[PDB]
């Protein structure tokens, strides 16, 4: 009964496409013609954090906007002090290749994972004074790509076996799973209200999942190639998505279609990380052109270039109060901007 | 109180500069292959025995080496291959399923996809053609699978620049060098000249497979160090 089911499925995406096309009355570029633009954004490198031995793959700001944790492929994970350029902890890892890096909102735990399919969580504030591993998670058969802390007992993960999954830190088992992707999931971004997250994969799809329910809410398909980058707007009602089309695309959750395309003719290289500002006006995107562009989110014009890295920017992070932008790249340096 | 935190940061940076000389003295080797290929004989003879990956930190000739085999993965290998840009070599293990889709054709398309990668443009491939005892035991049975399964074998001759082993049947030499220039056609079909291929006719229990990868890895860092000053 595959012939009737594929025709019913194609009529269902035709119904979804007609309902998406019926609800587009105006354009976001048309409605933002009363906004005075920001002009040129000038950012200078305030702190240059050196000390990593190899290529920095992932990074995560703390919630107090002073602590900072970065991962690298040499096999050691370094807790940073951003104001004084100090190193608080240096955590050696079992596996050399870590592609994700997470920091708890309470600051007590740091999780990381990579090609060994193990999400290792490390206890920072224990009594013995040394950073030891809390519990290894061993349920994914594919390579780990992204992880974000929800609580100190819950953590959602992205992996390369077409599966996202929630976790229990105390129990050690999967509370729920997310098995709706057809390609390798590379990133996820959490909501401010924490009950939703959206994850993009290699089949140019971003699925909005439900954390409590365990199902997929919406499907966003606007990109032409893989997706390496995803981020939520401050309010949690929209998200911007970076991919290998040299094109960032803004998707809205409520209208459930594509809002605005961020692209230029001169850029041919893909987007690795995206992050918003506190207001949501500035959208900063890493590239393989050895810099980071500051896109205005409502006007889609180049408002600034953070060009200080000698190699490819893998990760990007802005603080919770929006005070600083920290970019890490493949030349073992993580620079904190203005 | 801030000065002791600064001193702790200086101890952490001196610990990092202790491990920095450990890190740049180690050569990173990526192991690639399949389950048909011979890698259960590498675990007995090149000191793998002392998780989705199987790292091996081991030494020969007082030179640090570090091999890493990625286990069961998917067909779209384009996303975890960007993590291996800093390696010096790619160790490719091919078995011998010929004269016994296809396993050798899947290995040929795997070498085609790995060799023409964007992230592996400056990284050469060391090629191991394992299970050479199976290219001579089933020759005398006379099934002739390499003539049925490959139409280019009838127009292929033993090369004049090749160095065969004496005291051996020439059909075994044809069955060796047919796969050897089959795999060399993909390497010489690029023409960029930035990275090359090193074929070897290993058998599973060969105790010289470490010196082979030692001499070929010496050849890759000699390639880079002579290109740096425009000498090649």
């Amino acid at each position, epitope marked *: 009964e595959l012939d009737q089911l594929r025709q019913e499925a194609e009529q269902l995406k035709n119904q979804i496409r007609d309902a998406r096309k019926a609800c587009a009355d105006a354009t976001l570029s048309q409605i933002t013609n009363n906004i005075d633009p920001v002009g040129r954004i000038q950012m200078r490198t305030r702190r240059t954090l050196r000390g990593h031995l190899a290529k920095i793959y992932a990074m995560h700001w703390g919630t107090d906007s002073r602590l900072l944790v970065s991962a690298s492929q040499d096999g050691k994970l370094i807790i940073w002090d951003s104001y004084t350029t*100090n190193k608080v902890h240096a955590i050696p890892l079992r596996s050399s290749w870590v592609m994700t890096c997470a920091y708890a909102p309470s600051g007590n735990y740091v999780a990381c994972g990579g090609l060994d399919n193990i999400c290792s969580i490390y206890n920072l504030k224990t009594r013995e004074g040394n950073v030891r591993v809390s519990r290894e998670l061993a349920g994914h058969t594919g390579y780990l790509s992204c992880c974000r802390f929800l609580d100190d007992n819950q953590i959602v993960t992205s992996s390369g076996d077409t599966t996202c999954a929630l976790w229990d830190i105390e129990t050690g088992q999967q509370t729920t799973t997310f098995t709706g992707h057809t390609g390798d999931v590379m990133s996820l971004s959490l909501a401010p209200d924490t009950r939703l997250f959206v994850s993009g994969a290699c089949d140019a799809s971003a699925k909005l999942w439900d954390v409590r329910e365990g199902m997929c809410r919406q499907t966003f398909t606007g990109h032409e190639s893989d997706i390496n980058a995803i981020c939520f707007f401050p309010n949690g009602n929209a998200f911007a998505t970076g991919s290998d089309d040299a094109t960032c695309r803004l998707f809205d959750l409520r209208a459930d279609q594509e809002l605005m395309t961020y692209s230029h003719d001169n850029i041919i290289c893909g987007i690795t990380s995206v992050s918003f500002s506190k207001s949501g006006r500035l959208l900063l995107a890493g590239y393989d052109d050895f810099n980071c562009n500051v896109w205005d989110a409502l006007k889609a014009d180049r408002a600034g270039v953070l060009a200080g890295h000698d190699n490819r920017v893998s990760c990007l992070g802005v603080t919770d109060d929006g005070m600083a932008v920290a970019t890490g790249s493949w030349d073992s340096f993580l620079k904190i901007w203005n | *109180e801030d000065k002791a935190a600064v001193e702790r940061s200086k101890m952490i940076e001196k610990q990092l500069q202790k491990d920095k000389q450990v890190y740049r003295a180690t050569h990173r080797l990526l192991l690639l292959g399949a389950g048909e290929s011979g890698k259960s004989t590498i675990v007995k003879q090149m000191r793998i025995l002392h998780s989705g990956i199987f790292e091996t930190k081991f030494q020969v000739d007082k030179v640090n080496f570090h091999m890493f085999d990625v286990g069961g993965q998917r067909d779209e290998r384009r996303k975890w291959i960007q993590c291996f840009n800093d390696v010096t070599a790619i160790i490719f293990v091919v078995a011998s399923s010929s004269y016994n889709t296809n396993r050798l054709q899947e290995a040929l398309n795997l070498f085609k996809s790995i060799w023409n990668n964007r992230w592996l443009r400056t990284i050469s491939v060391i090629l191991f053609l394992n299970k050479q005892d199976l290219l001579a035991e089933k020759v005398l049975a006379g099934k002739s699978k390499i003539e049925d399964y490959f139409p280019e074998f009838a127009r292929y001759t033993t090369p004049e620049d090749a160095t065969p082993e004496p005291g051996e049947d020439p059909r075994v030499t044809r069955a060796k060098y047919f796969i050897r220039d089959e795999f060399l056609r993909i390497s010489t079909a690029s023409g960029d000249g930035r990275h090359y291929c090193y074929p070897h006719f290993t058998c599973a229990v060969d105790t010289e497979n470490i010196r082979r990868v030692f001499n070929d890895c010496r050849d890759i860092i000699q390639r880079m160090h002579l290109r740096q000053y425009e000498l090649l």
Partner: single-chain antibody, 233 residues
Framework: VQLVESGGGLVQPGGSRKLSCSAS????????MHWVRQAPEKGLEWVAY????????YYADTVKGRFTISRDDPKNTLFLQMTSLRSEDTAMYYC??????????????WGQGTTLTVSSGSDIVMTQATSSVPVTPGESVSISCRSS???????????LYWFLQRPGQSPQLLIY???NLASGVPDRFSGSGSGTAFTLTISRLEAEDVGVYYC?????????FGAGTKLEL
């Protein structure tokens, strides 16, 4: 976590006997170490300190020129050479464990203490006004302390530590950097104040909160403690 001291006893004046603190239950090489002594009739005072990795060594004004403090990181053992011992040096010597990074909790663990008895033959003062306060369980007594200069540094961090010394027990840490509570301390103590005046407020006091309360500044070295406020039922 266990710090056990040894090498104490009766000491002739002008003699020498070396104290030894043994560390167990924690990684000794990443923790700064202190020796803090207490008179049999007076309060605590600070003697010496080595940072982690044997980098810097500090002493007090009536301490330097006579003593020598040393560590042993594989053997996990503190040492304190005690030469030219005088009649004012009869005290109970505590082995003190501390760490220093941002957001750390120094002075969290204290030793049991060894007794060394000597026989016969600028600077910041801390003024604790009340010496004895007669308390009742449930009265919620708040006690205060004063400093000679403003302890609030230029980075926004003020430096004041609080202790509770039970009869027969070590002065365990309650509050570090005037606001923060230590690990294992219940949420009954709170501290606040300006850079000069400080107050420690207890709410809903039980029978386990009796003892002597002490301060410490980390504006600079040497470390001064104060008089002490005793709570009596």
């Amino acid at each position: 976590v266990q710090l056990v001291e040894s090498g104490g006893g009766l000491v002739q004046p002008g003699g020498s006997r070396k104290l030894s603190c043994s560390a167990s239950g924690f990684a000794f090489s990443s923790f700064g170490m202190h020796w803090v002594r207490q008179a049999p009739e007076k309060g605590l005072e600070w003697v010496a300190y080595i940072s982690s990795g044997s980098g810097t060594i500090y002493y007090a004004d009536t301490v330097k020129g006579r003593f020598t403090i040393s560590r042993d990181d594989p053997k996990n053992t503190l040492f304190l050479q005690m030469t030219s011992l005088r009649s004012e040096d009869t005290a109970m010597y505590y082995c003190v464990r501390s760490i220093y990074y941002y957001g750390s909790s120094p002075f969290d663990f204290w030793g049991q203490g060894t007794t060394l008895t000597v026989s016969s033959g600028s600077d910041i003062v801390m003024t604790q006004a009340t010496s004895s306060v007669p308390v009742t369980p449930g009265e919620s007594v708040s006690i205060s302390c004063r400093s000679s200069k403003s302890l609030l540094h230029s980075n926004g961090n003020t430096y004041l530590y609080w202790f509770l010394q039970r009869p027969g027990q070590s002065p365990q840490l309650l509050i570090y950097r005037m606001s923060n509570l230590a690990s294992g301390v219940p949420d009954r103590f709170s501290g606040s104040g300006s850079g000069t005046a400080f107050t420690l407020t207890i709410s809903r006091l039980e029978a386990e909160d009796v003892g002597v309360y002490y301060c410490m500044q980390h504006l600079e070295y040497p470390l001064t403690f104060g008089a002490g406020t005793k709570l009596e039922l």
